[PDB]
Design a protein around this nucleic acid. Structure first.
Ligand SMILES: [Mg+2]
Ligand SMILES: [Mg+2]
Ligand SMILES: [Mg+2]
Ligand SMILES: [Mg+2]
Ligand SMILES: [Mg+2]
Ligand SMILES: [Mg+2]
Length: 225
RNA sequence: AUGGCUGUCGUCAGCUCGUGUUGUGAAAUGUUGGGUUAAGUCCCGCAACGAGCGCAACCCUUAUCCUUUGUUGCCAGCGGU
């Protein structure tokens, strides 16, 4: 699907410097041009479409596909790419224990549902005005970190992740539950908890646009399927 | 040997717990950090997320007005002592 002639133009093949690299990433490194690692795209494209063709499978049963990015470099990009195929995101801070301790965080999805309903569908006026805003500032703080999963219900089946050592907690919560992990592993990040490592850059906004596109496109193809 | 009741630390701001995680284990996190407050007071940050008992608010008293109600209270303008 996605090939090598789009990525080099975009800026996927850039890693960090040569003092921050992870020595486990050495099967995915071409060399070091100007003190900065270059990633072999010959081992990126067959390992990017390897991850997409299984999102053909999991979107061929309407399986729940949670997208993860909290860098705030593409926090706005991860919502809209998850709202293309109306799948799920955590764009601001991943709460610790969101998946292992789900039925506790379930009680806060419900409170988010009642504060969203009361503002629009409730239409209840003439209430205590200094109390009216602590109810109102509650909504905007639960829309913030839980707002991507207001319409999910349970645990997902996949876990698409943008950085693997910025989101190391979200990997370990899907390690211990048996949810597969489809992550983008830059050359500083640890690929052990990731089941399907995808090397590349994660700081150019075009690169994370390219990733989230065809990840959503096969789930858009799966929903049509 | 106790029940009920009280003193005191001390009206000092604290003492916990479920689910989760880390640790072989006693346990730890939550409760820490940045500011702030009379205050675990509030905001922000943070593998934590939530909750309870205590922190305040609801009760009483004092302070200004307003209306209804005027005797055993009152006496302003209104007859005479
Ligand atoms: Mg243990
Ligand atoms: Mg505990
Ligand atoms: Mg503690
Ligand atoms: Mg304590
Ligand atoms: Mg503090
Ligand atoms: Mg309190």
């Amino acid at each position: 699907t996605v090939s090598m002639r789009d990525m080099l133009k975009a800026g996927v093949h850039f890693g960090h410097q040569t003092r921050y690299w992870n020595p486990k990433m050495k099967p995915f490194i071409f060399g070091a041009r100007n003190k900065v690692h270059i990633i072999n795209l010959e081992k990126t494209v067959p390992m990017f479409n390897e991850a997409l063709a299984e999102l053909n499978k999991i979107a061929s049963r309407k399986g729940k596909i949670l997208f993860v990015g909290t860098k705030r470099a593409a926090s706005e990009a991860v919502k809209d790419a998850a709202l293309s195929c109306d799948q799920f995101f955590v764009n601001h801070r991943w709460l610790g224990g969101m998946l292992t301790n789900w039925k506790t965080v379930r009680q806060s999805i419900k409170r988010l549902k009642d504060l969203e309903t009361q503002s629009q569908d409730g239409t209840f006026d003439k209430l205590t005005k200094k109390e009216a805003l602590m109810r109102t500032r509650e909504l905007e703080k639960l829309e913030n970190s839980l707002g991507g999963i207001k319409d999910m219900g349970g645990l997902p089946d996949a876990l698409f992740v943008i950085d693997a050592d910025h989101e190391h907690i979200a990997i370990k919560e899907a390690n211990n539950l048996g949810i597969p992990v489809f992550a983008i592993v830059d050359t500083n990040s640890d690929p052990d908890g990731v089941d399907f490592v995808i090397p590349g850059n994660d700081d150019a906004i075009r690169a994370v646009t390219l990733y989230l596109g065809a990840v959503a496109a096969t789930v858009r193809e799966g929903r049509s399927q």
